[model samples]
Target: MEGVKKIKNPSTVKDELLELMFRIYRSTNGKYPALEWVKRKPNPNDFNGFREVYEPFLKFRLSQEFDELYTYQKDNRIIGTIALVYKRIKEKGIWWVPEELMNEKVGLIEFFVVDPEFQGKGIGSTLLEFAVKRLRSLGKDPYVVTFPNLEAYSYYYMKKGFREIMRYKEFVILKFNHKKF
Candidate 1:
């Protein structure tokens, strides 16, 4: 595990993990979509309603199938997160839009979130660099297929040299091989 400074991997966050992820989505996506979500008569207990409406855009929480999950914590409170995923031969989550995989060995960056208050402090770049190093060590090239959900997230995935492999109605997919790391 790696982070802006120190890092750790937890089987689970000690408390309020969903809410923590929620704040990041809420902060970046802004409040209108959220308020509009509420106006849609969503379940109050749906945790944040971002994943349901936005699908691949906002990750509400980590899945049990997370290939490599890393977190940045301070005093036991998780402040940032990144996760990778590669499905087994027949494993796919409930989302209908299939993952566009380039190779069997490659992994997809499934979800990334940094606590809103903790953004712009190098936490994301550090975590991403660490993921690249770890993936290369495992002989795995990593890629990200995202919707460009929030403007603030551009710096991480849309930086120099990211190859735009494809584009869909709702997402833009990009790949980065080991050499790019």
Candidate 2:
């Protein structure tokens, strides 16, 4: 985990993050239908539109102090990234999460990606473990979701001690109990 580090200023690495995301996205294609809304004609040449689609969410996430961003950098080059969104239950509950976790502190893992070329190198697993450990210390129950079609992704999570707790439409929601890991 020597190369893993928190990304303090995400805006500074927008280009790298965007390119890495798109590369993984293009390779996985239909396996992640959950991201269809964000995949609108993603063009590597259109930084402005890409910023429009991605920056607002990043800005909003940054506004919440509990949210986190991390990356794996090797020789100054970023090869992977992950975002953890901490949620506090207000008057209503989070729709995507299961009922049992509604009142508990929750950390939803999002935007988890590794460079396509870096697959099977343990970078993704390291990032996930890093996020889970952080979330546990923050008193959060770790959760992640992906389309059920992504068997490999779900299998990997399963191997890391995450289990499917809910299946809604195309999504399979998995929960990780840090104590078990």
Candidate 3:
């Protein structure tokens, strides 16, 4: 995965994983108002705490939905991560597809981030490939979706086989169908 050099699913990934994600988010959204407000208002000394708010959601994902969490390491440091949340139609509701197709099974690819310094080098794509392989192994042809700002995150996902499904003011929904593989 890019400069990641190697990818591993470590036993415990608490602060380091969060930090990497935080760096990615900050780098990607630095120009946005919400994130800029977070930086200016919080005046947070410890960036880790800024990322801590996402811990509950990440934990729930690990314990309930996802089969595993992966970290990409570069020079023995965590540089990126991808969380694959497995969900059936009954569990996640019809979010990506139309309501008429509510019975279709799908998976959500969330919180995928690469260290800003290491982006454009294939780390994100590698993580995506890992998730896709895992989902396919489970005998589920899952559809993956992610919400990212088009202005900032469009090109990256587009290169990784995701297509823009819909867009709101600040966010764009992207989807990748497993059948395309």
Candidate 4:
């Protein structure tokens, strides 16, 4: 817990990144994640264009400029990570149904993860809350695209005051607004 720090520098990232990516890949049993838009399952059963959302992380850090990347490291061993794609919310202006979201710029929580052994310990929530706090500070809303995994059908997300906007057969989108709680 003491070593959990928001990365202030990207140059220090290359050393353990690929290895960490593999852990996340393996953690999901190769399916990797669930989400909305072109990534994850666009339909009920497809992953063809899924690489767009998270491949940068798999290879290494993001190519574009960023605010920070948070990691849980203990003596150079990284176990958890949450990436903030600030001001890069990539919706095609299609899911805008609610009146409140018509003019909102959504920040993204890219690839939120905590190694299996470290799960159920509030690490994921901590990372997400950190992102939401930062996004709100920047005057932008934040969201994540995810699916209805049986073990947790956006339930944890709801507990964190996120609401499901749209639910596809394969996945759903969650928006974070701490005030909604």
lDDT value for candidate 4? Answer: 0.59
Reference-based lDDT, each prediction: 0.56, 0.68, 0.56, 0.59
lDDT of 3: 0.56
> Can you list the residue pairs that collide in candidate 3?
none
Per-residue lDDT over 91-153 for candidate 1, one digit per residue giving the tens place of the 0 to 100 score: 645252355654567766645667879779998897888877777777777776554433344
TM agreement with the true structure for every prediction = 0.57, 0.62, 0.56, 0.56
lDDT at 127, model 1: 80
Q: Residue 91 in candidate 1 has what lDDT? A: 65
Extract clashing residue pairs from model 1: none
Q: Which candidate has the top score in lDDT?
A: 2
Model 4 C-alpha lDDT per residue in residues 1-181, reported as the tens digit of each score: 3556777775467546645655554555444444333333323222333344445434443445344688877666777787776543343333423435435475656657777778788777877788789878878777665544423546456656888787787678888887888
Q: For candidate 4, give the lDDT of residue 67.
A: 47
- Which candidate gets the maximum TM-score versus the true structure? 2
Each candidate's root-mean-square deviation in Å?
Answer: 11.6, 10.9, 11.1, 10.9
